[model samples]
Target chain A: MKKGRGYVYKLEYHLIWATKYRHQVLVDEVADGLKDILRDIATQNGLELVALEVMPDYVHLLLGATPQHVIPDFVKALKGASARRMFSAFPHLKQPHWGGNLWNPSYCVLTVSEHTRAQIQQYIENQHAA
Target chain B: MKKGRGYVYKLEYHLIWATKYRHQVLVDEVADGLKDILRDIATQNGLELVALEVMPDYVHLLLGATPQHVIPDFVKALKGASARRMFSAFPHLKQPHWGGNLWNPSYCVLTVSEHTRAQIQQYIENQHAA
Candidate 1:
């Protein structure tokens, strides 16, 4: 656990969400751009990005946050902002995303404690190989 | 990932919280009671309790949930319901908790993916020996 001025914590999460209708549009430049945008969002919002990967149809992220960070709030910012910027940058992604939304509304988020951080990180690192 | 009728998910969390002011009051029968109460709470809420352990001053849990379950809501239910029941059953626990709160308001919750669930469960199980 890391210590702050008055608190100690090791708050991390593994969050995943798929693209709308499971569209496999995140590739090449689109995938790289999404990764960059997500990293920037995490930095701007005081969240620490431990690991991140953009698959053809989904996103996998592992990040650390302080207790003050609300789950839904950051998730909304990440997905919403990424979608808006991605559409602007890569308009062709919108071809398969009919509803103007890039991501599926449903998402999966799980806690990652210190003990399993390395294991989870390596698992995500191996995503491409898998 | 587990699949439902229309969705697929693998949502799990490892949550930990300490007693108020770090009091080491959870021991003997008190610890046993807290475990039972927590298990019951999880069951009633449709959460699958993967593993749980009650340390001297804190509790560790690994559980599975559907995406529909909000984080704070379930956390509140587990903490609140356990505290109320514990206080009633073990009134002496109130001696160290002068503010009438059994647990510290702060907690640590991390995501546990399928890749790390067994590892986390073993870690929690080993807490006592550690």
Candidate 2:
């Protein structure tokens, strides 16, 4: 591993969010489209995409990044950007509410530690297994 | 059903976490025990414990609450309090990091809208299914 920065940091987070009205709208083509959109956002935004799952009702995001990329800012960039992208890509999934946005405003966020990185990775990885 | 306050708001959450080293340490008693601790913490904090599932390496908590309780404060209360309580109850589980405190610092946060109540409910309820 190349060590460049003076401070030691392994930024990892587990995030979740749901559809507007908690609708089961994330299915088929839209779900696939979302996965692509998320990956695009993660890379463009400097987020290391560990895992991303688009559930029928919710989505889970597990990734790594640097500390300077503050939490709230990262969340807004991803959530806000994705909402705008998803709505544009899949207009059919849009509801009457959310002003045509796909995802709900709020979401769940968890910080992952180094010790159990493997374990949490497994948990998130297996999210779509069954 | 007793009605009060005329205000209607249903708050809920789904949470997850892992052991210190991802050591596969969370098995049997420790798993069941953590569930109890979380439930206690939730109730004591005016949080409704909807559903909790403890995987060998991770934990899932689904709960409800009123809007008066804020997110950061609630997260700190739940994670911080549980870390102290868990370490005290099961000293064997503690490691050298965090001065003996468990749980990583940050956590995932997601908000649920009213529409998909039944779907996500089923997902969290059936987190352990094969």
Candidate 3:
């Protein structure tokens, strides 16, 4: 029989990214689209979505990922896919105001341990309220 | 002979809170008001403002505090004072929609150590871009 696999370390991370100018660009429909994309990505990467809040200009996501999954890559995928979907939905966005993209290049990522997990999770949940 | 002095433990913290509906409620003037209040709070508590980002509906702040300063109290002071100032400037807010308060009740706070300080600082700085 094959040897049992070693402990599969699961890392929980909080990821944040936003749009430029704090634009209220993501309306309800667009937000729904982005959510779908994110769910798909999480499923593909063997991740679990713990909490997520969508503000008009930015978003906060709390998730658990495996060791092999890269946070930056996951962020890129979500942002890129959302931009494409948004532009397709609103073609006029390709014009001057938006400059062909929906998101800014910078983002924040935090790796949480068991000790700080509850605090981080509460923070994410309270994002919209705050 | 001399009495002993306790260690002056420095507690650094990161805070995040957001408005509702991504309203862009804070224009340049309103943002300035909020900043002033925050600065005053920092000064009063003997804290240092390391990083801050004023997004349309949300704000992120990284600060260092002394052992005597309580994080929640600091947050309450900042929020309460800013709300009062904002309402005074924009009396219409008292009429409706805002319900007389500028902030939502929920917020996020994290305690940072030397190891995590830089990361939290970077996260706060990138709040707008992300």
Kindly report, for each predicted structure in the order presented, the TM-score of its chain A compared with the true chain A: 0.81, 0.79, 0.71
Please provide TM-scores, in order, for all candidate models, with all chains considered together.
0.66, 0.44, 0.40
Question: What tens-digit string does per-residue lDDT give for candidate 1 at B1-130?
Answer: 5545433445667777777765778899999999999999999988988999898777888878765676667888899999999999998877743455387775556664444445434433433321
Q: Give lDDT tens digits, candidate 1, residues A1-130.
A: 5545433445677777777766678899999999999999989889999999888877889879765577677888888888988999898877633555388775656664444445434433433321
Best by TM-score: 1
Off by over 4 Å in 2: A1-4, A97-101, A113-130, B1-130
Better of 1 and 3 by TM-score: 1
lDDT for position B60 in model 2:
64
The alpha-carbon lDDT assigned to residue A129 of candidate 3 equals 22
Fnat, one value per model: 0.23, 0.00, 0.00
What local lDDT score does residue A69 receive in model 1, on the 0 to 100 scale? 71
- Separate DockQ for every predicted complex: 0.19, 0.03, 0.01
Quote the positional error of residue A112 for candidate 2 in Å: 3.1
Error of 3 at A109 (Å): 0.4
lDDT of 3 by residue, B1-130 (tens): 0111321122345666655433466668777777776777677767788777776676767776543455557777767776777687776556356444366554556544344445434433433421
- Which residue pairs overlap in candidate 3's backbone? A17-B130, A18-B130, A130-B18
Candidate 1: stretches off by over 4 Å: A2-8, A18-24, A44-46, A66-73, A96-130, B3-7, B20-24, B68-73, B96-101, B104-106, B112-130
Give the per-residue lDDT digits (tens) of candidate 2, residues A7-109: 2233456766666655777789989998999999999999989898888767788867653455566677888888889888987766675434366556555
Q: Candidate order by lDDT, highest to lowest?
A: 1, 2, 3
lDDT of 1 at B17: 71
Error of 3 at A72 (Å): 1.9
- lDDT to native, each model: 0.72, 0.61, 0.58
